[PDB]
Amino acid sequence: MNRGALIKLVESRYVRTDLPEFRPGDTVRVSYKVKEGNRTRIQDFEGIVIRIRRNGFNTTFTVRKVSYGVGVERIFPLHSPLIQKIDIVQRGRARRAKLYFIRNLSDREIRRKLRADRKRIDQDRAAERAA
């Protein structure tokens, strides 16, 4: 037998391919289905992705934002059915896979360290030229 293949097989039903590719450093908006009273609704969460742990179906990514004066980080499964959509709001250029150092940087300092990933922006406009 092939244990890996069997696992991928169990997983194949839950895999998603409708979400856009993004990198650590990109700014991203995750529309997330969320439960309250007595309804479920979509809440957006928008921030820099500071990390993407890979493990195929199990890869997860972490997004950080400042909300009303307090730092928040959210961790999402990339294949979570609760994600309605992800919109790329900006491409940042990182030099590092994991950006935990931005937790201690000022807003000025961050903006200086994560400049616009001019290449991947142009690349983004190049597509988005449709038929």
Next chain:
RNA sequence: UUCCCGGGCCUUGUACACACCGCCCGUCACGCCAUGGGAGCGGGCUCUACCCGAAGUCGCCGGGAGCCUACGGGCAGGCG
């Protein structure tokens, strides 16, 4: 005629005149009031240095690159 009791006259000192059986000082005990000091405790104002930093004006850039053109430009956008 020094002394004691009483009185007369002159004088001198007096913070006494309820007139020396006068006046009056301080501690101590007691009650009341205001205050000082006192390990500290709470508050108000104020100065200094540095970190972060909204809005906004000003200044630079406006390109790997957007919109308007009125295109040697302007607006978005970025930096300070």
